[PDB]
Amino acid sequence: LPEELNRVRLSRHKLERWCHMPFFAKTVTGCFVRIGIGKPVYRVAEITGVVETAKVYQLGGTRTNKGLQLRHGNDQRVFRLEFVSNQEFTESEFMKWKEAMFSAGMQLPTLDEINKKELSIKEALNYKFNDQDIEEIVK
Amino acid sequence: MIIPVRCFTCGKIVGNKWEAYLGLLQAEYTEGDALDALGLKRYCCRRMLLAHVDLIEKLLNYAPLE
Amino acid sequence: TSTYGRYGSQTPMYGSG
Amino acid sequence: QQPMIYICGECHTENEIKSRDPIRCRECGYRIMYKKRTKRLVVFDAR
Ligand SMILES: [Zn+2]
Ligand SMILES: [Zn+2]
């Protein structure tokens, strides 16, 4: 279903609050994003890890140069956090992603996996900043 | 701190004349001539342009942001 | 205050660049 | 769902400070910050 898959969709507004929070390669790795390719067609890709690009760009108020190593079945390349769209996974895009996953041979994540992963972002959002992370954030 | 809106004694509007007063003083005119050039007959309304201190400038120097 | 999108703020594309 | 937003001292940049947290700005890092105007009906009489 597309509705259950949009629960872990990391929109463009949520990523602005974890630009410098540690454990970025743990809570983010697992979710899906609607990266814009470019005309209005979109392709859902899996978050394999985290990379850092040499180009510095501003995204509204804040500004980040980090990348995002994504993959859509087999075709993989470097992307940016500025091309991500806030739209939800449509039926056509959902079917396209399902077909790409089936063709690439990657087993579809089980429903319980998404159910237990969606809580990661929720518990990270209300995380108290009691440790020594503000120093690294300001740096 | 800022030019009042009306003369305390008389009541005539004097708020809309501070900029004109400064301009006339800058061009060539003196104070004694500028005051009656603006239209201030009574001596009670003339203190507003002579006694007033423009402290809003110093306040604006402490800009909050940028 | 999770995501005040209200659509969005004109999202750029990859090939457009 | 009000996280008690604040305004930084010198940056004048909004910050979300919750209870049991240090009082510092999201960037640079200072120790001074003020609050924002209330949302109540501040109504005066021009008297
Ligand atoms: Zn007078
Ligand atoms: Zn700070």
Side-chain angles (χ1 to χ4, degrees), chain A residues 2 22 25 30 36 38 40 45 49 54 60-61 67 73 100 104-105 109 124 127-139, chain B, chain C residues 5 7-17, chain D:
Chain A
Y127 179 84
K128 302 299 297 184
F129 305 92
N130 300 122
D131 64 77
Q132 55 275 2
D133 56 359
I134 301 101
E135 286 67 5
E136 286 68 4
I137 292 167
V138 298
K139 289 173 181 180
Chain B
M1 298 184 299
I2 182 173
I3 188 70
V5 185
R6 297 186 180 179
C7 173
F8 302 152
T9 295
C10 180
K12 182 175 179 62
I13 283 66
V14 63
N16 60 12
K17 297 182 176 60
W18 176 256
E19 299 299 346
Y21 185 68
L22 292 179
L24 268 63
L25 289 186
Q26 186 179 134
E28 56 85 2
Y29 295 94
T30 187
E31 297 74 355
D33 191 5
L35 292 168
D36 52 315
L38 294 177
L40 296 177
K41 302 295 98 180
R42 293 176 294 276
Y43 68 93
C44 68
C45 301
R46 288 188 181 176
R47 66 182 186 276
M48 296 299 179
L49 302 179
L50 304 173
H52 168 261
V53 71
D54 196 4
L55 285 173
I56 197 175
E57 302 298 345
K58 295 292 182 60
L59 304 179
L60 292 176
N61 285 9
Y62 307 94
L65 63 89
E66 182 61 17
Chain C
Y7 58 92
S9 60
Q10 180 184 0
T11 288
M13 300 298 181
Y14 197 172
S16 60
Chain D
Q1 302 293 354
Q2 299 304 144
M4 183 52 54
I5 191 177
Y6 286 160
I7 295 79
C8 176
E10 292 67 2
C11 305
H12 297 64
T13 59
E14 283 66 1
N15 305 130
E16 300 297 348
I17 305 298
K18 285 73 65 174
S19 301
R20 303 295 185 180
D21 300 325
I23 298 90
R24 300 186 64 178
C25 185
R26 293 282 76 86
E27 58 282 0
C28 70
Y30 297 156
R31 309 299 181 84
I32 303 170
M33 58 177 60
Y34 305 89
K35 299 185 67 176
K36 188 175 179 180
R37 296 178 56 83
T38 183
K39 304 296 180 60
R40 298 179 182 273
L41 289 301
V42 185
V43 177
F44 288 103
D45 182 356
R47 191 69 59 88

